[PDB]
Amino acid sequence: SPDTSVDNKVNFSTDVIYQIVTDRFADGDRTNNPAGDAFSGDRSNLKLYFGGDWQGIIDKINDGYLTGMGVTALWISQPVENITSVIKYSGVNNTSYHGYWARDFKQTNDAFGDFADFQNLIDTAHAHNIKVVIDFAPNHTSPADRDNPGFAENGGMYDNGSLLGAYSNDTAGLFHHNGGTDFSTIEDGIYKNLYDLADINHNNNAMDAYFKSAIDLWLGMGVDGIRFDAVKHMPFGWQKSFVSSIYGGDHPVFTFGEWYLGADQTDGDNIKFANESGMNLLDFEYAQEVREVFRDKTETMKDLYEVLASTESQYDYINNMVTFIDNHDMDRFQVAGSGTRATEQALALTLTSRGVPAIYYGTEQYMTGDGDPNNRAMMTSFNTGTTAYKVIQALAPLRKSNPAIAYGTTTERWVNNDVLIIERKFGSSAALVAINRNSSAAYPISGLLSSLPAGTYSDVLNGLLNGNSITVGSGGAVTNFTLAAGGTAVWQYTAPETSPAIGNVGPTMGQPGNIVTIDGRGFGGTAGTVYFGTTAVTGSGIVSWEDTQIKAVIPKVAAGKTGVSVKTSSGTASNTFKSFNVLTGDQVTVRFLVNQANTNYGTNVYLVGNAAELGSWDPNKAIGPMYNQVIAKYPSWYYDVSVPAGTKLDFKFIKKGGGTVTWEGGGNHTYTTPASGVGTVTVDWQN
Ligand SMILES: [Ca+2]
Ligand SMILES: [Ca+2]
Ligand SMILES: [Ca+2]
Ligand SMILES: [Ca+2]
Ligand SMILES: [Cl-]
Ligand SMILES: [Cl-]
Ligand SMILES: [Cl-]
Ligand SMILES: [Cl-]
């Protein structure tokens, strides 16, 4: 099947995701509605269930509302069984309508539907060429007070109906009992409770096994992607090991996490997570910047391009960035009382920009509302005639049809305070996008250059956002034109490719034996060669091969990041997909603890070792800075690390700070890791 197929679970840049808060979209089945204090019939309390469900989503697929927009993926609230108790917070009755307060990850939230309903949703979506992404929140269960078992449901965790444990009498040690985080440090936010949510202890193998089993259940039903909740609040090492187990199993899928960033914020740990965890991220840098430029109008198009350029520089897999202009955790993009062009332009940019675009339900209806839960009102209308609906309808399909949009580089062609003209390019395909955010002033555009072949190009939007046609000369030079006030236009060229071009490889990380999906153009119909670094993969190493997609088995090559490339049956070489992370083997999560490691203020302890997963003795790749406040206390340090299973590791600790790097003396520490699951190794610092 082709790169654009709904069957393609691991790569999503040809898609447009529509993010649905299930309870707030459509009530398709009144018979599963919660009742009494848990339900708001008059919708006056935005913290109770309103009744939205899976049948409702199914209905809006079948009746053409969603398909008419050209969305090709649905991202839905966590589907698992949540607590059913009503909690009074700050004078207001609250429910689990949002899906984040799980109690049994192996059963459904009955308010949304049963497993038959869920299968119908998967099957209906797939029959319409729509992928399904679920929220998954393995950080915690639900609200709990260790000292008051009667509060809520005491964070109780069930396994297909049978009790594993609750928070107050945590016999099996399933949870952390370290208080609640104050969000002051990353460590603090990982090993203490997020708000009052009973925090899962993933270093307990019972929990590693449980969550692997649970996710396998949902993936086995046909789920195409996973949006991880609160990734900043779980150990990086556990998450890396977790996704590796997905990639090495029967159901590799696209994964991405939420690591919130405010306006004007870049974060090195956020970048490391996206580059090294094996999991992708929502692109808050993009989102916040688009909001500043279009919604708040506090920064310029030059600032916008700067962020496109800096994100490109820092993230290894830029076609995996999940972009958006708002979501369940942000004020609604539409400002009440303001015009709609800001929304329409922000949508157009997102739909034509690199990555995987996501649109929050009701954006296309200009829904307003600041703060949670005002930003989660019931869908106001299913009017297919709005300008925003038509913008998405016109541009969403380009991600499937034009590989420059799906995979292409990004280049600034023209910029001033109010106007941005960018070009996407992939092989001979290109798209040129022009946006003028100024609603009162038109701008003459002169000396514009493009990679478009000669000829006249109509605006893909046909002037819906006051765009215009352009004429292109032999050298790609664009005849002078005026970009109207509020103007937005898209001009595009798609061509058959003869030379092979790789647009994406997914997943981006894997152990030998995993099957990866290589998407692009010009691979031809006859099986050729896949390369990992200089190592050729041929014959049975190639699972399947067609013009736009190749599936290949990761060869037993040296672990570490490497380039992936192809060569056609005729011997023509492709470009290289950079930074594919070859793992040593199946992973386990190991908690490393080192004792008696005293340091001066400003100096931290890091972990290094012989395996690629331990940085291959490179002090610049040393793992850390390690933690020393919660699980273990200074001068003990600890860190949870994904390492190859059933493998003898050689390792040492180092102290880095003040431009100095000091390694342990003595011989290496050694440790043979567990065959599966999780482990712990404790050693003492060697002077
Ligand atoms: Ca319902
Ligand atoms: Ca239909
Ligand atoms: Ca946690
Ligand atoms: Ca900014
Ligand atoms: Cl169906
Ligand atoms: Cl290219
Ligand atoms: Cl093409
Ligand atoms: Cl083959």
From Swiss-Prot:
It is an enzyme of class 2 (transferase). Ca(2+) 1 binds at residues 27, 32-33, 51, 53. Residues 497-583 are annotated as: D. Keywords: Calcium, Glycosyltransferase, Metal-binding, Secreted, Signal, Transferase. Binds 2 calcium ions per subunit. It catalyses: Cyclizes part of a (1->4)-alpha-D-glucan chain by formation of a (1->4)-alpha-D-glucosidic bond. Monomer. This is Cyclomaltodextrin glucanotransferase. The gene is cgtM.
